[PDB]
Ligand binder design. Structure first.
Ligand code: P0I
Length: 193
């Protein structure tokens, strides 16, 4: 789906609870040129461009969400799996108008489960910054204003092998807002050059 032979994303949701509301969701394939988006993330201090050339190009993905912003615990869940036992490092960078405003580094060790190696991060507190961002966003009176604010906002996520530092996955996230009758949606694209 979204990943490599070495690491597969199986689940991802961002949500709010009081039986829950998913802002965005991936459950479990066209291409895009990293060129079109180079200016959206950190300029050169280890951006989509420093990263992309260092390889390996098959690891880079673009994900466009159409978030459901009509609706408590603010959480994110993710689940990866692999056939090799690793400890994963996950750098997340939140970028607003190109400026990196947040960097988060997390770690997760493989748990063996049903012949596979599973990496789970279930109901982790959503970042301070995105929660507050969400509360300002929901008050805009028109979807096209939400999209205007969001066209300046991206998240770049880099998952590496912690004990080798091989890059396993690098995802760039861009966002729009869906309406009510259509809920969340995404499209996973592949970053080429
Ligand atoms: O896998 C993770 N850690 C991990 C730890 C060890 C090993 C592997 C992985 N994660 C934690 C960090 N993550 C995010 O902060 C994040 C990324 C994309 C969307 C998002 O929320 C969407 C909320 C807003 C966005 C703006 C308006 C619309 C809704 C949050 C991603 C998941």
């Amino acid at each position: 789906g979204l990943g490599t032979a070495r690491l597969q994303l199986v689940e991802f949701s961002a949500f709010v609870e009081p039986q829950r509301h998913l802002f965005v969701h991936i459950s479990q394939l066209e291409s895009v040129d990293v060129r079109q988006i180079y200016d959206k993330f950190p300029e050169k201090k280890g951006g989509l461009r420093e990263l992309y050339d260092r390889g390996p190009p098959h690891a880079f993905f673009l994900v466009k969400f159409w978030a459901d912003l009509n609706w408590g615990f603010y959480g994110v869940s993710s689940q990866y799996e692999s056939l090799e036992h690793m400890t994963l490092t996950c750098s997340s960078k939140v970028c607003s108008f190109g400026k990196q405003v947040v960097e988060k580094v997390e770690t997760e060790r493989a748990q063996l489960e049903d012949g596979r190696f599973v990496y789970r991060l279930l109901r982790s507190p959503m970042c301070e910054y995105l929660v507050n961002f969400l509360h300002k966003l929901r008050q805009l009176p028109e979807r096209y204003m939400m999209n205007s604010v969001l066209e300046n906002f991206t998240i770049l996520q880099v998952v590496t092998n912690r004990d080798t530092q091989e890059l396993l996955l690098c995802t760039a996230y861009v966002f729009e807002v869906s309406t009510s009758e259509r809920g969340a949606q995404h499209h996973i694209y592949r970053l080429v050059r």
